[PDB]
Each structure stands twice: as structure tokens, then as C-alpha cells.
Short mmCIF file of C-alpha atoms and ligand atoms in Angstrom, two decimals:
data_model
loop_
_atom_site.label_atom_id
_atom_site.label_comp_id
_atom_site.label_asym_id
_atom_site.label_seq_id
_atom_site.Cartn_x
_atom_site.Cartn_y
_atom_site.Cartn_z
CA UNK A 25 45.45 19.55 84.32
CA UNK A 26 42.50 17.80 84.56
CA UNK A 27 40.33 20.48 83.24
CA UNK A 28 41.91 20.77 79.70
CA UNK A 29 42.61 16.75 79.74
CA UNK A 30 38.74 16.32 79.30
CA UNK A 31 38.89 19.39 76.59
CA UNK A 32 41.74 17.07 75.15
CA UNK A 33 38.99 13.88 74.85
CA UNK A 34 36.33 15.59 74.05
CA UNK A 35 37.86 16.80 70.46
CA UNK A 36 39.61 13.63 70.27
CA UNK A 37 36.17 10.89 70.75
CA UNK A 38 35.01 12.70 67.34
CA UNK A 39 37.78 11.87 65.62
CA UNK A 40 37.57 8.18 66.90
CA UNK A 41 36.61 5.46 64.22
CA UNK A 42 34.45 2.48 65.12
CA UNK A 43 36.18 0.11 67.04
CA UNK A 44 34.33 -3.05 66.35
CA UNK A 45 36.90 -5.65 65.79
CA UNK A 46 39.55 -3.38 65.90
CA UNK A 47 43.07 -4.03 66.94
CA UNK A 48 43.93 -0.61 68.52
CA UNK A 49 47.53 0.29 70.13
CA UNK A 50 47.60 3.09 72.26
CA UNK A 51 51.39 4.88 72.77
CA UNK A 52 51.10 6.59 76.25
CA UNK A 53 48.07 4.99 77.45
CA UNK A 54 48.59 5.84 81.58
CA UNK A 55 45.51 5.03 83.34
CA UNK A 56 44.03 3.08 80.63
CA UNK A 57 41.17 5.37 79.71
CA UNK A 58 41.58 4.77 75.72
CA UNK A 59 42.06 1.17 75.93
CA UNK A 60 38.82 0.40 78.18
CA UNK A 61 36.78 2.95 75.63
CA UNK A 62 38.02 0.31 72.76
CA UNK A 63 37.40 -2.69 74.37
CA UNK A 64 33.60 -1.60 75.55
CA UNK A 65 33.60 -0.45 71.96
CA UNK A 66 34.16 -3.69 70.73
CA UNK A 67 37.75 -3.80 69.72
CA UNK A 68 39.18 -7.78 69.24
CA UNK A 69 42.67 -6.38 70.76
CA UNK A 70 44.14 -3.44 72.32
CA UNK A 71 47.76 -2.81 73.42
CA UNK A 72 48.79 0.09 75.78
CA UNK A 73 52.46 0.95 76.39
CA UNK A 74 53.36 3.05 79.02
CA UNK A 75 56.50 4.00 80.83
CA UNK A 76 55.20 4.34 84.60
CA UNK A 77 54.60 1.31 86.19
CA UNK A 78 52.40 3.01 88.85
CA UNK A 79 50.30 4.23 85.87
CA UNK A 80 49.92 0.27 84.56
CA UNK A 81 49.24 -1.12 87.80
CA UNK A 82 46.05 1.26 88.05
CA UNK A 83 45.42 0.81 84.61
CA UNK A 84 45.41 -3.32 85.13
CA UNK A 85 42.97 -2.49 88.24
CA UNK A 86 40.57 -0.33 85.83
CA UNK A 87 40.42 -2.80 82.94
CA UNK A 88 38.02 -5.81 82.81
CA UNK A 89 38.05 -6.79 79.08
CA UNK A 90 40.50 -9.95 78.43
CA UNK A 91 40.97 -8.20 75.03
CA UNK A 92 43.44 -5.48 76.63
CA UNK A 93 46.85 -6.16 77.40
CA UNK A 94 49.49 -3.38 78.96
CA UNK A 95 53.28 -3.53 78.56
CA UNK A 96 55.98 -1.32 80.39
CA UNK A 97 57.67 0.06 77.27
CA UNK A 98 59.06 3.34 76.02
CA UNK A 99 57.71 4.49 72.80
CA UNK A 100 60.55 4.92 71.29
CA UNK A 101 60.87 1.13 71.70
CA UNK A 102 57.69 -0.03 70.46
CA UNK A 103 57.94 -3.64 68.53
CA UNK A 104 57.91 -4.02 64.53
CA UNK A 105 54.75 -5.65 64.05
CA UNK A 106 53.88 -5.33 60.29
CA UNK A 107 50.04 -4.48 59.02
CA UNK A 108 49.08 -5.65 62.43
CA UNK A 109 46.74 -2.29 64.02
CA UNK A 110 43.70 -1.16 62.30
CA UNK A 111 44.40 2.10 65.07
CA UNK A 112 47.09 3.84 66.64
CA UNK A 113 46.25 6.62 69.31
CA UNK A 114 48.02 8.43 71.44
CA UNK A 115 47.36 11.53 73.94
CA UNK A 116 49.22 13.87 75.19
CA UNK A 117 52.47 12.28 74.58
CA UNK A 118 54.56 12.72 71.47
CA UNK A 119 56.06 16.06 72.83
CA UNK A 120 58.13 13.99 74.76
CA UNK A 121 59.35 12.20 72.29
CA UNK A 122 62.44 13.52 70.40
CA UNK A 123 61.99 12.27 66.79
CA UNK A 124 58.04 12.51 65.28
CA UNK A 125 59.75 10.80 62.14
CA UNK A 126 60.94 7.72 63.68
CA UNK A 127 57.25 7.03 65.28
CA UNK A 128 55.68 7.97 61.94
CA UNK A 129 57.61 5.65 60.03
CA UNK A 130 56.92 2.99 62.77
CA UNK A 131 53.34 3.62 63.01
CA UNK A 132 53.23 3.34 59.19
CA UNK A 133 54.53 -0.36 59.01
CA UNK A 134 52.63 -1.11 62.24
CA UNK A 135 49.21 -0.02 60.49
CA UNK A 136 47.28 -2.01 57.82
CA UNK A 137 45.90 -0.92 54.76
CA UNK A 138 43.69 2.28 55.28
CA UNK A 139 44.65 2.36 59.25
CA UNK A 140 44.25 5.12 61.85
CA UNK A 141 46.84 7.48 63.53
CA UNK A 142 44.97 9.85 65.89
CA UNK A 143 47.22 12.10 68.38
CA UNK A 144 47.52 14.78 70.22
CA UNK A 145 50.53 17.12 71.35
CA UNK A 146 50.99 20.23 73.35
CA UNK A 147 50.77 23.05 70.96
CA UNK A 148 53.62 24.50 68.87
CA UNK A 149 52.71 27.76 70.56
CA UNK A 150 52.72 26.57 74.02
CA UNK A 151 56.14 25.15 73.58
CA UNK A 152 57.77 27.53 71.40
CA UNK A 153 59.03 30.00 74.04
CA UNK A 154 60.32 27.54 76.48
CA UNK A 155 58.70 29.05 79.63
CA UNK A 156 55.53 27.72 78.67
CA UNK A 157 53.74 30.43 80.97
CA UNK A 158 51.81 33.75 80.31
CA UNK A 159 53.92 36.99 80.16
CA UNK A 160 52.88 38.85 83.45
CA UNK A 161 53.33 42.57 85.07
CA UNK A 162 54.33 43.67 88.36
CA UNK A 163 50.43 43.01 89.55
CA UNK A 164 50.41 39.87 88.01
CA UNK A 165 47.83 40.09 84.72
CA UNK A 166 48.59 37.32 82.29
CA UNK A 167 49.24 40.12 79.32
CA UNK A 168 49.84 37.99 76.46
CA UNK A 169 51.35 34.28 75.67
CA UNK A 170 54.92 35.28 75.10
CA UNK A 171 56.02 33.06 71.49
CA UNK A 172 60.02 32.59 70.64
CA UNK A 173 62.64 30.31 68.72
CA UNK A 174 59.39 29.32 66.83
CA UNK A 175 61.70 27.47 63.90
CA UNK A 176 64.21 26.34 66.72
CA UNK A 177 63.15 22.61 67.01
CA UNK A 178 65.06 21.54 70.15
CA UNK A 179 64.46 20.39 74.01
CA UNK A 180 62.41 22.57 76.09
CA UNK A 181 63.07 21.61 79.91
CA UNK A 182 61.67 23.09 82.78
CA UNK A 183 62.17 22.69 86.21
CA UNK A 184 60.35 21.55 89.53
CA UNK A 185 61.52 20.50 93.06
CA UNK A 186 62.72 16.95 92.17
CA UNK A 187 61.62 16.83 88.83
CA UNK A 188 63.08 17.47 85.52
CA UNK A 189 60.50 17.52 82.56
CA UNK A 190 61.99 17.41 79.24
CA UNK A 191 59.80 18.07 76.16
CA UNK A 192 60.60 18.49 72.36
CA UNK A 193 59.24 21.46 70.12
CA UNK A 194 58.72 21.11 66.78
CA UNK A 195 56.65 23.31 64.32
CA UNK A 196 52.79 22.78 63.21
CA UNK A 197 54.57 22.00 59.50
CA UNK A 198 56.98 19.28 60.99
CA UNK A 199 53.83 17.59 62.11
CA UNK A 200 52.00 17.77 59.34
CA UNK A 201 55.02 17.70 56.88
CA UNK A 202 56.51 14.60 58.73
CA UNK A 203 52.93 12.59 58.58
CA UNK A 204 52.39 13.68 54.65
CA UNK A 205 56.26 12.59 53.64
CA UNK A 206 55.54 9.16 55.38
CA UNK A 207 52.65 8.32 53.54
CA UNK A 208 49.65 9.29 55.98
CA UNK A 209 46.68 11.33 54.42
CA UNK A 210 45.75 14.45 56.60
CA UNK A 211 42.12 13.64 58.11
CA UNK A 212 41.52 16.50 60.78
CA UNK A 213 43.53 18.84 62.39
CA UNK A 214 42.05 20.70 65.33
CA UNK A 215 43.11 23.22 67.99
CA UNK A 216 40.82 22.71 70.84
CA UNK A 217 39.18 25.25 72.80
CA UNK A 218 37.86 24.45 76.63
CA UNK A 219 34.91 21.92 76.13
CA UNK A 220 31.11 23.16 76.08
CA UNK A 221 30.21 22.04 79.53
CA UNK A 222 33.47 23.85 81.08
CA UNK A 223 33.48 27.05 78.59
CA UNK A 224 31.68 29.50 81.38
CA UNK A 225 34.37 28.58 84.29
CA UNK A 226 36.48 31.31 84.89
CA UNK A 227 39.89 29.67 84.56
CA UNK A 228 39.01 28.29 81.27
CA UNK A 229 38.87 31.85 80.09
CA UNK A 230 42.43 32.49 79.15
CA UNK A 231 42.39 29.35 77.14
CA UNK A 232 40.32 31.15 74.48
CA UNK A 233 43.96 33.32 73.84
CA UNK A 234 46.62 30.60 73.06
CA UNK A 235 46.13 27.34 71.62
CA UNK A 236 47.47 24.76 74.76
CA UNK A 237 46.80 21.63 72.21
CA UNK A 238 47.15 19.99 68.85
CA UNK A 239 45.07 17.31 67.92
CA UNK A 240 45.65 15.17 63.85
CA UNK A 241 43.92 12.48 62.55
CA UNK A 242 45.37 10.79 59.75
CA UNK A 243 45.34 7.70 57.33
CA UNK A 244 47.89 5.19 56.22
CA UNK A 245 47.78 5.68 52.03
CA UNK A 246 50.08 3.06 50.37
CA UNK B 28 58.57 39.36 53.15
CA UNK B 29 57.52 39.19 49.16
CA UNK B 30 60.48 37.40 47.57
CA UNK B 31 60.51 35.20 49.99
CA UNK B 32 56.86 33.93 49.80
CA UNK B 33 57.35 33.26 45.77
CA UNK B 34 60.43 31.13 46.68
CA UNK B 35 58.38 28.77 49.04
CA UNK B 36 55.41 28.99 46.65
CA UNK B 37 57.52 28.23 43.72
CA UNK B 38 57.86 24.60 45.06
CA UNK B 39 54.34 23.97 45.95
CA UNK B 40 53.24 25.10 41.77
CA UNK B 41 52.51 22.21 39.74
CA UNK B 42 53.42 21.66 35.99
CA UNK B 43 51.88 24.29 34.38
CA UNK B 44 51.88 22.71 30.61
CA UNK B 45 47.88 23.02 29.37
CA UNK B 46 46.60 24.15 32.57
CA UNK B 47 43.77 26.71 33.28
CA UNK B 48 45.37 29.05 35.47
CA UNK B 49 43.42 31.44 37.94
CA UNK B 50 45.45 34.29 39.71
CA UNK B 51 43.63 35.94 42.76
CA UNK B 52 45.05 39.07 43.90
CA UNK B 53 47.44 38.99 40.85
CA UNK B 54 49.43 42.36 41.54
CA UNK B 55 51.48 43.05 39.26
CA UNK B 56 50.92 39.40 37.44
CA UNK B 57 54.15 37.72 38.52
CA UNK B 58 52.26 34.55 38.57
CA UNK B 59 50.36 34.98 35.58
CA UNK B 60 53.58 35.18 33.54
CA UNK B 61 55.36 32.59 35.20
CA UNK B 62 52.00 30.07 33.89
CA UNK B 63 52.19 31.34 30.81
CA UNK B 64 55.90 30.42 29.74
CA UNK B 65 55.55 27.19 31.57
CA UNK B 66 53.27 26.32 29.00
CA UNK B 67 49.28 27.25 30.40
CA UNK B 68 46.90 27.27 27.71
CA UNK B 69 44.67 30.04 29.44
CA UNK B 70 45.52 32.23 32.51
CA UNK B 71 43.22 34.84 33.80
CA UNK B 72 44.26 37.44 36.93
CA UNK B 73 42.25 39.47 39.09
CA UNK B 74 43.02 42.44 41.01
CA UNK B 75 40.89 45.02 43.05
CA UNK B 76 43.30 48.13 42.22
CA UNK B 77 43.22 49.49 38.72
CA UNK B 78 47.11 51.33 39.53
CA UNK B 79 48.60 47.99 39.69
CA UNK B 80 46.72 46.35 36.99
CA UNK B 81 47.54 48.98 34.61
CA UNK B 82 51.23 48.06 35.69
CA UNK B 83 50.16 44.48 35.26
CA UNK B 84 49.19 45.04 31.93
CA UNK B 85 52.34 46.73 30.58
CA UNK B 86 54.95 43.98 32.02
CA UNK B 87 52.70 41.01 30.57
CA UNK B 88 53.31 39.73 26.76
CA UNK B 89 51.90 36.64 26.26
CA UNK B 90 48.22 36.56 25.18
CA UNK B 91 47.58 33.27 26.58
CA UNK B 92 46.81 35.42 29.92
CA UNK B 93 43.98 38.28 29.99
CA UNK B 94 43.40 40.56 32.98
CA UNK B 95 40.16 41.63 34.81
CA UNK B 96 39.81 44.28 37.53
CA UNK B 97 37.28 42.38 40.32
CA UNK B 98 37.81 41.84 43.84
CA UNK B 99 38.52 38.37 45.25
CA UNK B 100 34.96 37.95 46.88
CA UNK B 101 32.99 38.86 43.16
CA UNK B 102 35.43 36.19 40.96
CA UNK B 103 32.78 34.64 38.40
CA UNK B 104 31.39 30.93 38.99
CA UNK B 105 32.48 29.00 35.86
CA UNK B 106 32.30 25.35 36.67
CA UNK B 107 35.03 22.93 36.02
CA UNK B 108 37.21 25.83 34.09
CA UNK B 109 40.33 25.58 35.72
CA UNK B 110 43.50 23.29 36.96
CA UNK B 111 44.75 25.91 39.47
CA UNK B 112 44.19 28.60 41.14
CA UNK B 113 46.85 30.82 43.02
CA UNK B 114 46.28 33.57 46.02
CA UNK B 115 49.71 34.95 47.20
CA UNK B 116 49.14 37.04 50.65
CA UNK B 117 45.52 37.82 50.01
CA UNK B 118 42.72 35.86 51.58
CA UNK B 119 43.69 36.92 55.28
CA UNK B 120 42.30 40.27 54.02
CA UNK B 121 38.89 38.50 52.56
CA UNK B 122 35.80 37.76 55.38
CA UNK B 123 34.53 34.57 54.60
CA UNK B 124 37.38 31.76 53.37
CA UNK B 125 34.33 29.47 53.34
CA UNK B 126 32.96 31.15 50.48
CA UNK B 127 36.32 31.26 48.80
CA UNK B 128 36.56 27.60 49.43
CA UNK B 129 32.72 26.95 48.09
CA UNK B 130 33.71 28.90 44.66
CA UNK B 131 37.19 27.45 44.03
CA UNK B 132 35.87 24.00 44.42
CA UNK B 133 33.11 24.53 42.03
CA UNK B 134 35.59 26.59 39.79
CA UNK B 135 38.35 23.77 39.77
CA UNK B 136 38.53 20.58 37.45
CA UNK B 137 39.38 16.99 39.11
CA UNK B 138 41.89 16.82 40.92
CA UNK B 139 42.83 20.73 40.20
CA UNK B 140 44.89 22.27 42.71
CA UNK B 141 44.04 25.50 45.17
CA UNK B 142 47.46 27.05 46.60
CA UNK B 143 47.91 30.13 48.85
CA UNK B 144 49.50 31.77 51.39
CA UNK B 145 48.42 34.02 54.16
CA UNK B 146 49.55 35.84 57.06
CA UNK B 147 49.98 33.36 59.94
CA UNK B 148 47.18 32.66 62.70
CA UNK B 149 50.43 33.81 64.97
CA UNK B 150 50.90 37.16 63.36
CA UNK B 151 47.20 38.55 63.12
CA UNK B 152 45.76 36.94 66.64
CA UNK B 153 46.59 39.32 68.90
CA UNK B 154 45.81 42.22 66.83
CA UNK B 155 48.90 44.53 67.33
CA UNK B 156 50.89 42.94 64.45
CA UNK B 157 54.60 43.59 66.40
CA UNK B 158 56.49 42.35 68.60
CA UNK B 159 56.50 43.26 72.77
CA UNK B 160 59.20 45.47 73.84
CA UNK B 161 60.46 47.03 76.83
CA UNK B 162 61.22 50.83 77.82
CA UNK B 163 64.23 50.56 75.59
CA UNK B 164 63.09 48.83 72.28
CA UNK B 165 64.18 45.58 72.49
CA UNK B 166 62.11 42.80 70.62
CA UNK B 167 61.34 40.62 73.99
CA UNK B 168 58.84 37.97 72.27
CA UNK B 169 56.17 38.05 69.88
CA UNK B 170 52.38 38.22 71.83
CA UNK B 171 49.73 36.27 71.10
CA UNK B 172 46.71 37.15 72.59
CA UNK B 173 42.78 36.10 71.56
CA UNK B 174 43.95 33.14 69.27
CA UNK B 175 40.57 31.82 68.90
CA UNK B 176 38.66 35.53 68.32
CA UNK B 177 38.16 35.12 64.65
CA UNK B 178 37.22 38.29 63.74
CA UNK B 179 38.56 41.45 61.93
CA UNK B 180 41.58 43.24 63.04
CA UNK B 181 41.73 46.60 61.95
CA UNK B 182 45.24 48.61 61.97
CA UNK B 183 45.77 52.42 61.52
CA UNK B 184 47.67 54.66 59.69
CA UNK B 185 47.28 58.47 58.47
CA UNK B 186 44.58 58.18 56.04
CA UNK B 187 44.05 54.46 55.96
CA UNK B 188 42.43 51.50 57.66
CA UNK B 189 44.07 48.48 57.04
CA UNK B 190 41.21 45.15 57.32
CA UNK B 191 42.55 41.84 58.10
CA UNK B 192 40.37 38.99 59.25
CA UNK B 193 42.14 36.62 62.03
CA UNK B 194 41.44 33.07 61.67
CA UNK B 195 42.79 30.34 63.01
CA UNK B 196 45.25 27.67 61.61
CA UNK B 197 42.07 24.91 62.13
CA UNK B 198 40.11 27.06 60.00
CA UNK B 199 41.78 27.37 57.48
CA UNK B 200 42.66 23.56 57.18
CA UNK B 201 39.09 22.16 58.49
CA UNK B 202 37.28 24.75 55.95
CA UNK B 203 39.47 23.00 53.12
CA UNK B 204 38.54 19.84 54.29
CA UNK B 205 35.13 20.38 54.51
CA UNK B 206 34.55 21.37 51.18
CA UNK B 207 36.32 18.69 49.79
CA UNK B 208 39.99 19.25 49.48
CA UNK B 209 43.15 17.41 50.21
CA UNK B 210 45.63 18.85 52.14
CA UNK B 211 49.13 18.51 50.12
CA UNK B 212 51.53 20.35 52.11
CA UNK B 213 51.31 22.83 54.97
CA UNK B 214 54.41 24.96 55.09
CA UNK B 215 55.46 28.24 57.56
CA UNK B 216 58.47 29.72 55.67
CA UNK B 217 61.45 30.89 57.24
CA UNK B 218 63.23 33.03 55.29
CA UNK B 219 66.69 32.52 53.55
CA UNK B 226 69.01 44.09 57.97
CA UNK B 227 65.54 43.12 60.24
CA UNK B 228 65.44 39.44 58.90
CA UNK B 229 67.44 38.81 61.86
CA UNK B 230 64.64 38.66 64.23
CA UNK B 231 62.12 36.68 61.68
CA UNK B 232 63.32 33.34 62.46
CA UNK B 233 61.77 33.66 66.00
CA UNK B 234 57.52 33.64 65.17
CA UNK B 235 56.08 32.30 61.88
CA UNK B 236 54.80 35.25 59.47
CA UNK B 237 53.21 33.63 57.00
CA UNK B 238 50.81 30.34 56.26
CA UNK B 239 51.17 28.45 52.79
CA UNK B 240 48.52 25.77 51.85
CA UNK B 241 48.75 23.29 48.73
CA UNK B 242 45.70 21.35 47.94
CA UNK B 243 43.57 19.84 45.51
CA UNK B 244 40.09 19.27 44.52
CA UNK B 245 38.62 16.29 45.63
CA UNK B 246 35.16 14.26 43.93
CL1 CL C 1 60.82 14.77 64.09
CL1 CL C 2 35.50 31.77 57.43
#
């Protein structure tokens, strides 16, 4: 879980613009890694938004810069602040949001002219079937990755003891077309392979077989 | 599959009026006839097969449209000559999509479009190009494997090898981007018998792109 979170960051870093004197919004900031990074690369103002109080306490403990503020808030509830941001970021968060269209409308408004919108979601191929796991035989070999219901843009629920995880499946089309119809230009679309530091690692070998993540960089056009 | 490809591709097509068009893998020439009657000043359609190009010239009336017997990878370098380049279900049979992009960029005018369709990476990844079935032949789900393994996919029939090249969604999009195209539209079509199972996995990938200078 932390292994492929490093695989996300490696590709995401190469998408990032220069942060000097930029105003940054981080949707689903967690422990505030992107907010810290932005600050120490010269951002004038960073807002980190997350739902978990536990995570924001750890974020504020890890953040020294007076440039960064944190707020407990749902991503669907972000404030309308027209033209306030140079860049909006979101790492592994938007596949938990029901209307990606609403998020794009709000990000568009909140961004200045030629503002940046860079995000990563769990891949449509990862979420399509719903089981979010390998197809296995009797001995337990991962035979292949199952894909089903690809055009059923609906909730995907998974069950653990005491937890209910709720995600929303969307197609590659929907992510790209939603950005385009909302006035964004597509700069990059990447499906990350494992980071070159951990490409040898035995557990990372199944990650070449199906994509786990979708990363997209987009620019506001008026 | 073929008619379903057209329905969605038609929607991507620009105004053809006094546009110079190139159709790659033109088959029986459907796009070439379409463009000519929608006001194109000049159209060139190419195909490898002589049998299909015989039928193509047979069912074509307009003198705006010329045909040649030529493979896609051997298209002529003609700088700033075309307004629009089309390719329907053809580029997944070509090894270097980068090479096609380099030539199409050069052959297009400013703000000219490159519109194409291929078999979707999810259809081509595993290589078996078929459902996973149990012992009684229920179609269980569609199998994905070796997604980032970008190489040949061969299928065998009596008397023929079929050779396709598997590429990722990244590859198609990032290659267009690095060769100076702007992405205008990316669509994975659904259809409008055994079309019943087609809503379950994507079969085709359609991209519309514009030349940027
Ligand atoms: Cl949406
Ligand atoms: Cl290529």
C-alpha cells in the first residue's frame, strides 16, 4: 500500500509545475506531504483539505511553514474562491467522489488563468469489476486481472471488518471528456509502472500486468 | 463493430469543405466518399490490399478522390499538404505508432486534425482476445494481463497469422502529445445477438487530435 503510493509520487513529481510564489490547493492532503513539498519549493500560500482529523493533526505536526494551512472539510464542500489558485492537486482521492464533473466545475472556477489541475485516481480497470483483486485458481495463482461492468459508472463497495469502503467507478473517457468539456486542456495522461528503485522487488511484478492508477495533468483554458 | 466504429467516428469528423483529406487503411473507401460529398477539394485513400481497392474504386464516383496501393508505414512525405488524416481500426496493426505520428504531423497543415480508432489496450493486453469462461462456457469476465508489455500479439487460424501490436492508453496519448498534437477527444464507444456482452468491457479506443505548431 505504501509501496505503490511511492509509485504514484514518482510520476506525479514529474507533472508538477514550479511552485515559487504560487497559490496551491491540495484536495485530500492526508499527512500533508504535497503541502510541505509546495511550501519548501516556494509557494506563497497552500491550503490542505482532508476529512480525517487524525491525519490533519499529523499534517500540522509535520509542517513548519507559516505558508500552509489545513482545514477539516469534504472535497465536495470546498469553498468557491474564484481565480484564487495557480495549482490544484489531488493524490488518490477523486475516485471516492460521486461527481467528478462537480469537482471539475469548482476547480475551474477556483483556478486563475492558465491554472494547473493535476490528479491521480485508482484506474478504471482497477475499479471496473468491483472485486478489486486478481482472478485466482485453486492453488491461489493470480491468473489474470478480471474486468467487468466497465461502462457501469456506479458505486463500488468493498467490505472489511468494521469498515465500508465506497468508491465510484468511471471510465477513462469520463475522466478525459469531463476535463475537456469543463474547459481544461490535457497536458499528460500516465498509467504509472512501479518506480525504478523498486522495479526488481518480487511483489511489484504483478503491477506490470494491469494498471492500478491513472494520473492526469490539465491546464485551465478560457 | 465496423458500423459502430463509424457512428462514433462520424461525430469526431470536422467540416470537410475545401479540406485536403488522407485516409489510412481506406478499405472500400467509405470515408473518402463521405469527405468528397461534404465538400473536400482533394482526397487520397490508401490500402495494402488490392482486392479491397478494386472494390473501392468500383463504388466511388467523385473525381476529387484518388486511390493508391500502399502500406500505412510507407506513406509519402508531403509537408503541409493535408487538413485531415483519418484511420479506422488500423493503427494497432502497425509496429511504430511514433513513426506514424511523426509523418502525420509533417503531412498536416496548421490546426489540421488526426482522427483515428484502434482496438482498445484492454482488448489487446492479455493476447487471447476473448472472454474467460468456465468449463460450461459462461462468459465470466474479461481477462487483463501483461498490460505494460508493449509488443506483438499474434493470433493463429488455419492459413493465417494475425499480427497486432499492444500499446497502453498512455502510449497512444503521450506519443500524440510529444509529437506536437493537442488532444481534443478520447472516447471508448459502447454499441447502440452477441452485442449483449459488449457493455462489459471496452473494445475500441477513439482519439481526435489537432496539429499544434
Ligand atoms: Cl462525473
Ligand atoms: Cl510506438
